[PDB]
């Protein structure tokens, strides 16, 4: 069935599109009126990397900088993190530095991290330069991509790249 199980966590400010990324990748589904995530959940998908089949086990929770009982179990055994922002709200980009710190504080030291600018379909309303975002990602030892959970733009490739970076 599958050769490797990779646990990957989704992180970033509330509203940035984390849950729709998860539903786009795992179910090819999108919800425009999706509410803030109560609790913790995950969904899975198998991909090919090398000869090998890899089950991606993707975790999702609300984006909150506050401490929670669930934090340590959320990062526990996580081998990659998608750190996401909404390209049409600079604030969500501003808060990236803090989520990095959260990973420093909580995730494993060798966690593969990918910065993800989501909602790239919102191009009239761009608040975050791609070039700048990418310089920031390069500088901080991060993988980088822009996506639209709504379009499907780069959603598969986002997940493909972190999992290949993990394998």
């Amino acid at each position: 069935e599958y050769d490797y199980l990779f646990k990957v966590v989704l992180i970033g400010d509330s509203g940035v599109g984390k849950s729709n990324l998860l539903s786009r990748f795992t179910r090819n589904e999108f919800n425009l009126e999706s509410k803030s995530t109560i609790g913790v959940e995950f969904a899975t998908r198998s991909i090919q990397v090398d000869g090998k089949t890899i089950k991606a086990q993707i975790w999702d929770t609300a984006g909150l900088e506050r401490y929670r009982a669930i934090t340590s179990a959320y990062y526990r055994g996580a081998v990659g993190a998608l750190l996401v922002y909404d390209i049409a709200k600079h604030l969500t980009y501003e808060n990236v530095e803090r989520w990095l710190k959260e990973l420093r504080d909580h995730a494993d030291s060798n966690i593969v991290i990918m910065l993800v600018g989501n909602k790239s379909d919102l191009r009239h309303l761009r608040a975050v330069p791609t070039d700048e975002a990418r310089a920031f990602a390069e500088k901080n030892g991060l993988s980088f991509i822009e996506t639209s959970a709504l379009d499907s733009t780069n959603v598969e490739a986002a997940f493909q790249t972190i999992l290949t970076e993990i394998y």
């Binding site: 795992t26 609790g39 913790v40 899975t44 009982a69 179990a73």
Partner: protein, 35 residues
């Protein structure tokens, strides 16, 4: 006013419950959910 206070009691209940769920039977948090 203390509607906010019940909210965090509820949230905190969820978190302490989820910790135990994650450690013992994480499969129950799978979307979608198979027994």
């Amino acid at each position: 006013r203390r509607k906010d206070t019940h909210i965090r009691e509820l949230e905190d209940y969820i978190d302490n419950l989820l910790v135990r769920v994650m450690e013992e039977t994480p499969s129950i948090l799978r979307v979608p959910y198979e027994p």
